[PDB]
Ligand binder design. Structure first.
Ligand SMILES: NC(=O)N[C@@H](CC(=O)O)C(=O)O
Ligand SMILES: O=C1C[C@@H](C(=O)O)NC(=O)N1
Ligand SMILES: [Zn+2]
Ligand SMILES: [Zn+2]
Ligand SMILES: [Zn+2]
Ligand SMILES: [Zn+2]
Lengths: 344, 335
């Protein structure tokens, strides 16, 4: 009989659900499998108020198929103009589970982003005071920094000084992609965690660039050299308990991916969980798989572990080539491939 | 506006393709360049004298009347090519050079008799210098080739003339700079103008995707310094490498920049920025002929520093062709 892997129902600690018709298409891929997800706030315009988060939460709930037990955990997009009182109210009311810091840029509109981290110290101090976790997309985006160096540079110039300045702040280093970040997180304290995507465990930059350019593997932070991939694999396989599942499922229509300027992001919600199983199996570390998927995130966030179970079966299945949208189509992670593990 | 008059250039590394694509792209080259080295990587490749003669005629058929353009043909090396076939083509003026692609040839040691014949007859070897092993990071493949293939080959065949095509690294720039009169290189406009950030920051840009891949800024800067120094064994080779739009903009986009329409003005900009216009003519019009033992062109063209607006697309029989720098501006124009 085909091998079965039973786990406590997982959660996705880093997800993009988009809005409108695309939200309606993509939510089911998450809600069928995961009990909760951290829903990122990078809509156009971004979610920067309690009222917007409440309304978005309801649009997500509207799109959940009948019978799925799925709870979106909302986030606030940090911006220069965000009122610390607004963030705190949302946290106190259970609307915002966390706040998300995207890379700083001096040219950012104060309504849409952060100009410098120093400029938002009032909101960061407030998060520290109230115990609200900060989720970080840790890259510095200065034009003179090579794209492959941007994560490592963030550690030195932003992450370490911030954590020294605000010693009680809880931080998730999202979607880490480098040995630099893996080591930093491994050597950190109980207030520092990380998420890792399936693509950054499965692939390295050669997969994106050798034999052709593959925009469906193009995402931020960019896939790194093999030595970084291996460090990430070793970190999850070690059993380190402050790394956890965050897909960064980030859907874009096919025409927006396969263009003269392809958008960053992998639509991996359909195939992520089986992909993680494949990685943990290859690393001879399946004894750490459930904790990564279903325990470590809840522990860091101070939330209960799910009390229902799901099963993956080690039986081969083909991934769809594409998934229809109202207009155009979405190309899933591993489209058309035969995969080793799927959900029963 | 400033005007720069130069000897008519040549393009020492060009892909013209075949069929309808050839008809579309040839005029962008023939209107400007006196000669071009026409690469042999057709499907199937040009590996015989007969095939090269027929291809040359198809190229000439596509050259507008009044363009004095001569294609210089090349042979695609393979592990099993007959040295007599290659020499015959050289002696007949059919093959100007032979091109070594990384695997076709199973290995270089496998082609030693062909390379020995080339050395004896004075036929230049044009090298796409990358190693191919799956575990080698793509950004390392040029540097690794220098140590494991290029330096051993040149030590074995010390009289062989070699062009290190489309160099992309400080490693290659330094190797060529420090080499002897039997080693030269070509450099494309894209590897002087851009680095990998331009291809990957703010979106993935398949029209900048080419082999050898764009490298880190430190490599770009080394290439710029090399051409600006006046070093006389580097010369213009566009590696213009056209593909239809939806072969580029795809789930697995093809490598190659269609830069023939914009290359010359783009090079002029680089030389100007590097305060090295005194070395521009030699790069475009003298160094390559010197290395190949061919006369310089006897006509002259002018560039003017007036912005040229690059077309968004070029019509094909099916699909379109997106020029390198589509919709952008080039600072220098051909008068
Ligand atoms: N440079 C490229 O990316 N492509 C060239 C091949 C080559 O010059 O090696 C082509 O012919 O398409
Ligand atoms: O930081 C990001 C954003 C995400 C998206 O498309 O929302 N896509 C990515 O690849 N990374
Ligand atoms: Zn991110
Ligand atoms: Zn994200
Ligand atoms: Zn080449
Ligand atoms: Zn080429």
């Amino acid at each position: 009989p085909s091998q079965v892997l039973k786990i406590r129902r997982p959660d996705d600690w880093h997800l993009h659900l988009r809005d409108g018709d695309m939200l309606k298409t993509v939510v089911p891929y998450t809600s069928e499998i995961y009990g909760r997800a951290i829903v990122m706030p990078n809509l156009a315009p971004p979610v920067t108020t309690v009222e917007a988060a409440v309304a978005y939460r309801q649009r997500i709930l509207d799109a959940v198929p009948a019978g799925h037990d799925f709870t979106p955990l909302m986030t606030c997009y940090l911006t220069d103009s965000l009122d610390p009182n607004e963030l705190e109210r949302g946290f106190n009311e259970g609307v915002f589970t966390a706040a998300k810091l995207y890379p700083a840029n001096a040219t950012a509109n104060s309504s849409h982003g952060v100009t410098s981290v120093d400029a938002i110290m009032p909101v960061l101090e407030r998060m520290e005071k109230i115990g609200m976790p900060l989720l970080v997309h840790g890259e510095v985006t200065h034009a003179d920094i090579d794209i492959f160096d941007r994560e490592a540079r963030f550690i030195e110039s932003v992450m370490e000084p911030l954590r020294q300045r605000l010693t009680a702040l809880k931080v998730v280093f999202e979607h880490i992609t480098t040995k630099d970040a893996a080591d930093y997180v491994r050597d950190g304290n109980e207030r520092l965690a990380a998420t890792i995507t399936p693509q950054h465990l499965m692939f390295n930059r050669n997969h994106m660039l050798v034999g052709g350019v593959r925009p469906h593997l193009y995402c931020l932070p960019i896939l790194k050299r093999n030595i970084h991939q291996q460090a990430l694999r070793e970190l999850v396989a070690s059993g380190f308990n402050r790394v956890f599942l965050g897909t960064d499922s980030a859907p874009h229509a096919r025409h927006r991916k396969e263009s003269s300027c392809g958008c960053a992001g992998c639509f991996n919600a359909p195939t992520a969980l089986g992909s993680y199983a494949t990685v943990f199996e290859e690393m001879n570390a399946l004894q750490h798989f459930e904790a990564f998927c279903s325990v470590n995130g809840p522990q860091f966030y101070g939330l209960p572990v799910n009390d229902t179970f799901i099963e993956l079966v080690r039986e081969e299945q083909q991934v769809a080539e594409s998934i229809a949208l109202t207009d155009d189509t979405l190309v899933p992670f591993l489209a058309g491939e035969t995969v080793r593990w799927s959900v029963k």
